[PDB]
Subunit: 339 residues, 3 copies
Amino acid sequence: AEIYNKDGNKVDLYGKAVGLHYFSKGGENSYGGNGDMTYARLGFKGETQINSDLTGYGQWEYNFQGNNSEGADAQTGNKTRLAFAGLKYADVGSFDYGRNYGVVYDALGYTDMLPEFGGDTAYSDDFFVGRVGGVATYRNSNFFGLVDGLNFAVQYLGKNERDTARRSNGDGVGGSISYEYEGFGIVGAYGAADRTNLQEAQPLGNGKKAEQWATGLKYDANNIYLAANYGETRNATPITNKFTNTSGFANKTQDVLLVAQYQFDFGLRPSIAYTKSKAKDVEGIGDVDLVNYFEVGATYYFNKNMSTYVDYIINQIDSDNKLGVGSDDTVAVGIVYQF
Amino acid sequence: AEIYNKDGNKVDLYGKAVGLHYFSKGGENSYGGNGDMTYARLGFKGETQINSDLTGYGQWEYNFQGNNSEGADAQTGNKTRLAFAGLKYADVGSFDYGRNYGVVYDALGYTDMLPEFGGDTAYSDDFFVGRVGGVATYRNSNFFGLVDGLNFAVQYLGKNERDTARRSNGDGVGGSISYEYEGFGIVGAYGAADRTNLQEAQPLGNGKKAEQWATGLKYDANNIYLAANYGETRNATPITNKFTNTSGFANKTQDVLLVAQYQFDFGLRPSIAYTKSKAKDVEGIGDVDLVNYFEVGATYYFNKNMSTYVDYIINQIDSDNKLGVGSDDTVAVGIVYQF
Amino acid sequence: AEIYNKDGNKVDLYGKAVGLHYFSKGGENSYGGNGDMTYARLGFKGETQINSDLTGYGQWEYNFQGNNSEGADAQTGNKTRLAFAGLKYADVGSFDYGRNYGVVYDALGYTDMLPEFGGDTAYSDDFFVGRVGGVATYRNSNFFGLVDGLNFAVQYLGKNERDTARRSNGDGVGGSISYEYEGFGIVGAYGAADRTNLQEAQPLGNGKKAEQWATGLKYDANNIYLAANYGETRNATPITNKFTNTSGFANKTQDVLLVAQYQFDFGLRPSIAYTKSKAKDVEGIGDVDLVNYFEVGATYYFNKNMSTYVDYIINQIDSDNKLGVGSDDTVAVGIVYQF
Ligand SMILES: [Cl-]
Ligand SMILES: [Cl-]
Ligand SMILES: [Cl-]
Ligand SMILES: [K+]
Ligand SMILES: [K+]
Ligand SMILES: [K+]
């Protein structure tokens, strides 16, 4: 909500409280888990006019987990989601630096619209597919204000040598090109980065370069949302063999995302989706499905602040998965207040 | 403070800064401890009108400890207190889910009014007596809008298998019935829940069911506050034998709470209280007093935002306590700003 | 930004998003490090009028690090900076308690004005030089409203026995006297405190008393800022021998701070500084320079909300430093949004 708006500077303090619970078998062997998954969000989105052409901004976002105790495990899953500050200059472009979404997410944000789950390939702290720290993102709107709908972006991923190879990355350059014409929209994104010494030492994944590319096709008009995403990654997708306890990456992945959603005028929004992600050239196995399911769910909007949703996952992953990926179904029930 | 109120949606961002210090002997052997106990609070309480009869809401609250260093122990005692979202519908009732107070606290909140201490039996993450995660609370006002003063509530505690048996719980159902007539108020609360496998493995506490019940009697009118609480728990109250280093629960407890407070028109609020909590059928000992003291303190209100208080505990616990519970007195001095 | 101002009570919720990156050789051997150093701030500064003469207040501040992953290292560098509540009474003085700046910082805040670095001697959780927990600070303005410019303060440091000797302190009393006359300003601060048993056990540092004193001279008028600080500490400055892996304190230090900054009317603010801190009577070595460099940088202000800065450190520390202190240069580039 906009709490301050004086002398060219506007401040929007936002947040949400989500009463969430998962229903599964037993739910260590399921898709999403079992039990309470209550969480809360908090952050600010500010914007200031320096002049008639130039505008400065800065956004922060935090995730608070409310499914923890007040004891020792009080900080489980508590982290900063977004943290960046930038400048946009008329019909030239916008530049920002800090913790922000990757350029491949510009294509993956097409199918990431499900009530609770979905967007399985949009991994956090994973080069260019999700939220990554130390990225210099340049974004352009309408090709310098000349060609309508034609947007392009470029990103510079800084070297992030961390404790775990799961969250580590080297120096990388990514980009995306998008065109939109009356409801329809097409995106073409690609990113390539170096792999750290800790990532190379892992028994899973082999290569000196990590590549990620994705294409998007959506129709967003007349209360209809039909979306499609196809992507492939090289030494980038984080994998874990549960039988041998081994961490690393998949050498080759092939991802298919399909989402169909409709918005009724009285508030209800049904959702039907399909997700398939197959890992290839995996050392020890070969070919294994990481993510495979059908999605059936609905989100009911009371207004702009209150919403309730159900999300059911028809998991197509079988219990004969060589990695040991969860096979059981997961049902999500959530109640949301947001400001 | 109410920072946003437009189009049926009101947002109240609140918080407090408390400059607190405890005075004790040595204070590992005392009731509350010794040294700096500065803390800060932050959170939001929002509410939105969907229609003339229906209202949606969501509340979040966090505790920040300011008695820590900026080094390694920077996150000691930092956690989320409340995190839930719910809907209230005219004269039908209110339903909410997430992290919220238990139904037994509806009776225990009667004597939990002391300047600093008190409410010893209101343990956090303990089935139904305090703040617990994964609770579906249904609350009714004035019996569907028919009988004045007569309120009743029902709660559904979800299974919370955690790292420690101290913070763990199974599936449980609780309830409370309250009647208020001109100053006077009487509450009757009860809750029963399953005990997890980790709780059963502990050398202290034996049973497959955890039960908690409490009754309340208060007079809150004409600047007078006289309150009384009596309760008993089965395999629920968290205990720790300091001689043998053993964790678990007490098989049977008997709790007595008595509070007498007066509010003067110039700001000062004196407080006199008595608390006794005896644990019975304790394996190895038998009968031991967990909490036993007299309370003498006062809170001075400057206005609605600023307040200072002193809280002195006349600890009646002797140094011959077989569990090894603190015997020394504890003096609290605090300065509070709140918005 | 002031978000609430009704009935004598004003609430200022503030924060900043800083997109920061350090440039260094390799940067474990440098002055400031290498890589992403994005961080975010959040907190409130409230003030309420009780009457025409008396005013109550309370301030809180938190640091969020945005250079971390969403995994295990998500809470690295996240802590509370300020947490206190106090009362100011007309021309008598202001008293506050909690986590607050030390009295020696009143002199050290003179040269702590650099774009990114500087203020090396202002160590956090270090008796009186920086931010410390459990301090009762009394501050006086204009000598009870009689002598203009003449301010004096007194502090009472509470005993803070913590996990590490680095962050530990005993009981202490500090004070500061400041006089300002038309641009010019002179400060004289001193503080003395007890050393805990854990601090005494450390192989570095010897003594039962920790002393800190500093003098300040600045000229702050006509867009000119020329500042100077000279100080000496006894068994107070935290040191670490990187060759032997030893923690403790320096027996004697001598600190010299010099800062020269100018403010241009179009927004740009150049900065030239010099810092020297020499540790004496160090057990095993004798005399070693902790901090020694020249500073060249500039901060450009777009308005009151947006700012960009560059900070270059010409490190004069040689690689023959017997403690093993970083010798390489460090370049800082930052983009800031604040509200
Ligand atoms: Cl997310
Ligand atoms: Cl509490
Ligand atoms: Cl700082
Ligand atoms: K998920
Ligand atoms: K307590
Ligand atoms: K620094």
